[PDB]
Amino acid sequence: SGLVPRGSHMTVVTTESGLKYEDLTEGSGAEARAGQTVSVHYTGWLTDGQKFDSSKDRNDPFAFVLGGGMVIKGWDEGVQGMKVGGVRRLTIPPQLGYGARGAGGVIPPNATLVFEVELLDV
Ligand SMILES: [Cl-]
Numbered sequence: 001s002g003l004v005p006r007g008s009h010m011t012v013v014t015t016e017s018g019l020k021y022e023d024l025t026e027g028s029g030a031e032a033r034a035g036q037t038v039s040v041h042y043t044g045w046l047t048d049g050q051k052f053d054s055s056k057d058r059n060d061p062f063a064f065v066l067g068g069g070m071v072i073k074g075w076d077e078g079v080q081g082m083k084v085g086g087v088r089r090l091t092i093p094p095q096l097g098y099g100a101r102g103a104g105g106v107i108p109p110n111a112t113l114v115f116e117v118e119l120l121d122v
Contacts, residue, residue, distance in 0.1 A: 020091040021078050029084025030122045034067030038079060039121040045114045052106045061120055072097050074113070082119040090115045 006012050007022065014020050032038050039061045043054040055062045064070045066079055074092030082088050092113040094100070102109045 015077065017073070017077060017096060018093045019074050019077050019096055022089045023082075023086060024089055024116070025085070025087040027083030027086030027119055029119075032066055032079050032082045032084075032119055032122050034076075034080060036066050036122045037063055038066045038119060039063040040079065041118045041120060042115050046107070047112050047114065052104070063121075072113075075115075075117075078115075079117060079119065082117070084119050084122060087116060087118045090117060 005014055012020055012022050040063075041055050041061050043051060043056060045051050064075075067076050069076065072092065074090055074096035077096070078088065078090040078092070090113075092115065094110045094112060097111060097113045098107050100109050102111060107113065
């Protein structure tokens with residue numbers, strides 16, 4: 001608990017795993033639930049602002065089985081509860097990301113990852 005961890009507008013949520021998220025836009029559509037194949041647009045940045053991945057730049061949304069272990073842990077946790085049309089900012093500590101290994105030649109070891117995710121379909 002505590003006040004300061006809830007952010008400048010009292011809108012930052014911290015979960016038991018240490019994931020943080022903030023709903024930038026609350027969707028009006030159906031809720032994302034574990035087991036659904038959801039489709040999203042996203043961008044990811046390192047904490048220095050460097051973009052490392054974006055579906056928008058490929059002009060192709062990304063579909064995955066939510067909760068299915070097919071993405072980093074912070075995504076499987078953080079996309080749940082979004083509603084279609086929503087935009088959520090995920091701040092993913094490295095144990096819920098790529099850990100000590102990093103990834104792809106573009107995410108260093110022990111990196112916190114920032115994503116903005118738009119939920120398109122469930
Ligand atoms: Cl933070």
